[PDB]
């Protein structure tokens, strides 16, 4: 019968919870209770990119910290020059409902995807000189909510059918499929060394996957609602999760337990994007209150606010070298802050 | 030196010209999110006006030289609270319902679906066009005796046909009393906690009706006019 297996699983969960509690010798707040604060941090909008008609869900920086691709819900990708506010490329999409975009580490390719369940890859360095779909990756049974390049040829896509997949471009067929999430996966963050990654889903639980191994490794919980954003710490031994309960949390892989909770009674609307600074000392987080926020990852006190968006903040991205922070919003504007 | 940056400036100018053309063609079209259930009959609605894995379908139709751009969602999972936020910029949300769904009931599940759409955070401004489909099959279901609408909804016994009713000639009074009870169930939710930012436009449509192209236009026209008058504080 399934009942006895249910009690066995419940006992296993209780044992794991007891072990995690035993491993909690002390709280991170006590250790950092006498650390040096950073003080209030203020930022000013250096650039404001315009040209997108409808809202913006996706925005990805390049590896040179100079070009960023931005996707708009009218069916348009635009590659900007953050230095000169110059539109390098403007690529129309076959599907006008795009929920994500990416940027190859080599800078040769971009990707899109969304409500049509298809991830289309565009090569920007064609011999002719135009932009055309190198290929599309059909096979998912739910809206593709995120996709991040591992290299020029491996791309991992998380879909709304509760399963992530790893595809090889040349083959065009699913190399691997990671299943186990009960709710649809919202955002996956690749490791700094791109050997592991983390997938947060709508079941209020995140998972760690080994892309080479092909199965889950660790499971992290604590959130009370949908996980909207995942981001790895710069050194790759931690990640921050932002959810709909308007709280952020920091999880350490080796400790396999929550460390610090960034929350405030004033905050009511949930987080929609998170990102970390290049040194990991500064955690940026967009919200539904139409403005971003800045936290210190250790002291866990707000050290800045990025107001200036008159609609929902959907995408937030810090450069690889951590100079500028771009924020796109549902008002069809991107703002670079420095 | 200046030749390079001039070349990128020329590229930006041509790209911006293309974006202005795309804005001109995009701002002139009306995007409709067609909703409903598997048994409602939106498939026949799409097929009838189709006279001009994949996670979304597409049908383009023109009414009086106006571009309408209807999105039928298919091949998706049951949960719809995370991709429904993509449709917070559409002109209207068509919500087709099978009127004869009762006799389990399955008509209360349509009210709860319309209840959740109405009060969603991002759909507070999107007006809903309501189509009461299967208006033919409802006629025989109530004109059979083995319907008993009162058990599913107790209030049908105490409900009287409204004064502003305009029944079609030759319709049985018992048919029309049942017909207008269902409509007033959806208009109970719409008029409760909706302010004036969005409205509902019920229609007693059918699968063999050619006016559905006109009914969507005549109500999208009403929605845009009400939007302009709000910016001028004329309403």
């Amino acid at each position, epitope marked *: 019968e399934l009942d006895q297996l*249910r009690q066995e699983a419940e006992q296993l*969960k209780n044992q794991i919870r007891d072990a995690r509690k035993a491993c909690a010798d002390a709280t991170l707040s006590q250790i950092t209770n006498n650390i040096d604060p950073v003080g209030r941090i203020q930022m000013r909008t250096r650039r404001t990119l315009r040209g997108h008609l409808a809202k913006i869900y996706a925005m990805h920086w390049g590896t040179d910290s100079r070009l960023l691709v931005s996707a708009s819900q009218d069916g348009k990708l635009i590659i900007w020059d953050s230095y000169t506010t110059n539109k390098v490329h403007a690529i129309p999409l076959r599907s006008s409902w795009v929920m994500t975009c990416a940027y190859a580490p080599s800078g040769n390719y971009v990707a899109c995807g969304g409500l049509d369940n298809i991830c289309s890859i565009y090569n920007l360095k064609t011999r002719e000189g135009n932009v055309r779909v190198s290929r599309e990756l059909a096979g998912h049974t739910g809206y593709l909510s995120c996709c991040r390049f591992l290299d020029d040829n491996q791309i991992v896509t998380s879909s709304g059918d509760t399963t992530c997949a790893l595809w090889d471009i040349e083959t065009g067929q699913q190399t691997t499929t990671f299943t186990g999430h*009960t*709710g649809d996966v919202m955002s996956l963050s690749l490791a700094p060394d791109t050997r592991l990654f983390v997938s947060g889903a*709508c*079941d*209020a*639980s995140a998972k760690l996957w080994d892309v080479r191994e092909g199965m889950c490794r660790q499971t992290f*919980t*604590g959130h*009370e*609602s*949908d996980i909207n954003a995942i981001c790895f710490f710069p050194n790759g031994n931690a990640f921050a999760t932002g959810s*709909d*309960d*308007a709280t952020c949390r920091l999880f350490d892989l080796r400790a396999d337990q929550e460390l610090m909770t960034y929350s405030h009674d004033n905050i*009511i609307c*949930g987080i929609t994007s998170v990102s970390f600074s290049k040194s990991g000392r500064l955690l940026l987080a967009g919200y539904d209150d139409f403005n971003c926020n800045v936290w210190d990852a250790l002291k866990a006190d707000r050290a800045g606010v990025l107001a200036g968006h008159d609609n929902r903040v959907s995408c937030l991205g810090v450069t690889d070298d951590g100079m500028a922070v771009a924020t796109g919003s549902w008002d069809s504007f991107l703002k670079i802050w420095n | 030196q200046r030749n390079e940056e001039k070349a990128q400036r020329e590229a930006n100018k041509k790209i911006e010209k293309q974006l202005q053309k795309d804005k001109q063609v995009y701002r002139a079209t009306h995007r409709l999110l067609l909703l409903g259930a598997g048994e409602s009959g939106k498939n026949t609605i799409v097929k009838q006006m189709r006279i001009l894995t994949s996670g979304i379908f597409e049908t383009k139709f023109q009414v009086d030289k106006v571009n309408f751009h209807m999105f039928d969602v298919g091949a998706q*999972r*049951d*949960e*719809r*609270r995370k991709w*429904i936020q993509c449709f917070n910029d559409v002109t209207a949300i068509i919500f087709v319902v099978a009127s004869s769904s009762y006799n*389990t*009931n399955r008509l*209360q*599940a349509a009210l*709860k679906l319309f*209840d*959740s759409i109405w*009060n*969603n*955070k991002w759909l507070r401004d999107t007006s809903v066009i309501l189509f009461l489909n299967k208006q033919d099959l409802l006629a025989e279901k109530v004109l059979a005796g083995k319907s008993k609408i009162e*058990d*599913y*909804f*107790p209030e049908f016994a105490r409900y009287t046909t409204p004064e502003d009713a305009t029944p079609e000639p030759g319709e049985d009074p018992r048919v029309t009393r049942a017909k207008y009870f269902i409509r007033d169930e959806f208009l109970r939710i719409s008029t409760a*906690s909706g302010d004036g930012r969005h409205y509902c436009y019920p229609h007693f449509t059918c699968a063999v009706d050619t006016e559905n192209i006109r009914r969507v236009f005549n109500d999208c026209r009403d929605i845009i006019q009400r939007m302009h008058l709000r910016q001028y504080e004329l309403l």
Partner: nanobody
Amino acid sequence: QVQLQESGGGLVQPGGSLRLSCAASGFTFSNYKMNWVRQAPGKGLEWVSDISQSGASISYTGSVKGRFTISRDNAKNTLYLQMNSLKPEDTAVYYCARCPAPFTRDCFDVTSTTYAYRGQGTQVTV
């Protein structure tokens, strides 16, 4: 981890009364509206009753009007369902369902067949 556990169901003669309790752990009880959804044999999930954050707004389905009643103890973070004048058609599995996000008037896909914030269920036969 969010956990919901319902109890108090079982076989009963028609016309009796039931007291089903829903214990919730892992989240602030007050912020979320909560639902009671039943599934009859051979049929899909069906929504029965709902109570809001403060407990002021209570709504029922047509088939349970004037018979069932619900309440929420935020201090004891539990949900209640009380039955009156049972019928043979009420034999079903009852699931105490939650709301995906706090501070919202109503929320989607509670009655879905793959929802996450619902309990194992109580089988009630008449």
